[PDB]
Structures are given as structure tokens and as C-alpha cells.
């Protein structure tokens, strides 16, 4: 029991942010009306977290997966709780995963979506002002404000776990 209690603070600190990730997962699934699916309903089976081994301290064209599941719904996969936890966990928290790899795809999608939205909305503008407005939309300040007003930064995992020094037990 002493050996098992040695690991207790780490387990509790992971459970904290796993519960935050579950909250985010359920909230986003419900907002998309996808919460009634067999995958995402009461029968959700969370897959175990996966080690991101890329981290430093750890004839024919193949169809693209995201586009494959964009047009056909049979390839839709449940949004994993571990994936949301990785999205929340910053690199400063010296955990075994971070938000870096997801951020690349998220940034690319945000840029593409803002570009198409502005092009469809303001089709009678020159390229210069469209580029400027897009740079404003995807700027750090805009994303910062529009995530602060979503009450997300109160649930982020961004500090290294030093239980003895900067941690308050339950």
C-alpha cells in the first residue's frame, strides 16, 4: 500500500485534467448534435492515452483521411478524451504529450476557413485588404479573446507537476 500510495499524486493530477477533457468532449459533441451517435452516447469507451514518441523527452495517390470522412459519414470516428487532454496539455507541463501536433492542423484549418469565409463574404475587395483582415482574424489577440470568453483557460494544463512545492492536496 505504501508503494501504491507513492504514485497517488500523479494519478490525481492526471484525473483532474482527464475530467476537464471529458467535460470539453461532451460539450463539443453536444454542440454538434453528434452526442446521440452510438460512439459518443452513454456507451462511450475511452481509448487509453498513447505515448507521443516523437517528443524529444520521450501510379496511385493514397486518399486523404480528413477529406474521406468529410464527404462520407461512415468514416466518422469518436472524438477521443485522450485527444482532448493532449489538446489541453501545454508543453510547459513536462508531460508525455502536448498540444503541438494538433495545433499545426488546427492552425491550417483555421487559416483555410477564414480565407474561404472572407472570400465568400467580401468577394469585391482587392487581395491586400483581404489578406490584412485574415491576418487580423487568425492573430493571437483575436484567438486569445475568443477563447477567454469561452471559459477554457480556467481548465488548461500548463504548469509542471511539482507536488511537494506548488500543489495543494484535495
Partner 1 sequence: KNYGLQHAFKMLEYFKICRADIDKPLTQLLNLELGGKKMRANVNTTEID
Partner 2 sequence: VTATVNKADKSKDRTYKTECPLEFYDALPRVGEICYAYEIFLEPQFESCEYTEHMYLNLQTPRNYAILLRNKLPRLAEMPLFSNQGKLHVRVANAPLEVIIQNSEQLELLHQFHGMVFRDILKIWHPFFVLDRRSKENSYLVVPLILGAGEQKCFDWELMTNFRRLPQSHGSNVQQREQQPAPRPEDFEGKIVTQWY
Binding-site partner at residue 77 among partner 1, partner 2, none, CB < 5 to 8 Å by type: partner 1
Under the binding rule (CB under 8 A), the answer on residue 96 touching partner 2 is yes
Burial label for 83, CB within 10 Å (0-12, 13-18, 19+), is: middle
The set of residues, in sequence order, having a beta carbon less than 8 Å from that of 142 and lying 6+ positions away, is 136
Closer Cβ to partner 2, 72 or 166, answer by number: 166
Residues 19-58 that bind partner 2 (CB under 8 A): 19-20, 22-23, 44-49, 51
Closer Cβ to partner 2, 49 or 93, answer by number: 49
Under the binding rule (CB under 8 A), the answer on residue 64 touching partner 2 is no
Contact range with partner 2 by CB under 8 A, out of 33-41, 66-74, 116-124, 160-168: 160-168
The answer to whether residues 158 and 90 touch, using CB atoms and an 8 Å cutoff, is: yes
Burial label for 157, CB within 10 Å (0-12, 13-18, 19+), is: buried
In the complex, what is the shortest distance from the CB of residue 20 to partner 1, in angstroms, rounded to a whole number?
17
The three cell numbers locating residue 109:
484549418
- Measured CA to CA, the distance from residue 104 to residue 108 in angstroms comes to 6
Query: Under the rule (CB under 8 A), what is the footprint of partner 2?
Result: 1-12, 14-16, 18-20, 22-23, 44-49, 51, 80-82, 85, 96, 136, 140-142, 148, 153-156, 163-164, 167-170
Amino acid at each position: 500500500l505504501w508503494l501504491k500510495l507513492i504514485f497517488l499524486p500523479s494519478i490525481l493530477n492526471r484525473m483532474y485534467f482527464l475530467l476537464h477533457a471529458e467535460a470539453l468532449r461532451k460539450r463539443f459533441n453536444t454542440y454538434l448534435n453528434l452526442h446521440l451517435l452510438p460512439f459518443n452516447g452513454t456507451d462511450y469507451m475511452p481509448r487509453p492515452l498513447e505515448i507521443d514518441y516523437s517528443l524529444k523527452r520521450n501510379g496511385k495517390v493514397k486518399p486523404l483521411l480528413i477529406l474521406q470522412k468529410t464527404v462520407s459519414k461512415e468514416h466518422i470516428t469518436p472524438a477521443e478524451q485522450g485527444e482532448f487532454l493532449a489538446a489541453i496539455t501545454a508543453s510547459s507541463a513536462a508531460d508525455v504529450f502536448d498540444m503541438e501536433r494538433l495545433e499545426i492542423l488546427g492552425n491550417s484549418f483555421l487559416k483555410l476557413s477564414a480565407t474561404l469565409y472572407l472570400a465568400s463574404k467580401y468577394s469585391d475587395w482587392n487581395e491586400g485588404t483581404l489578406t490584412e483582415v485574415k491576418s487580423k482574424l487568425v492573430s493571437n489577440r483575436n484567438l486569445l479573446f475568443c477563447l477567454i470568453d469561452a471559459d477554457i483557460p480556467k481548465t488548461l494544463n500548463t504548469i509542471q507537476f511539482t507536488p511537494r512545492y506548488t500543489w495543494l492536496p484535495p
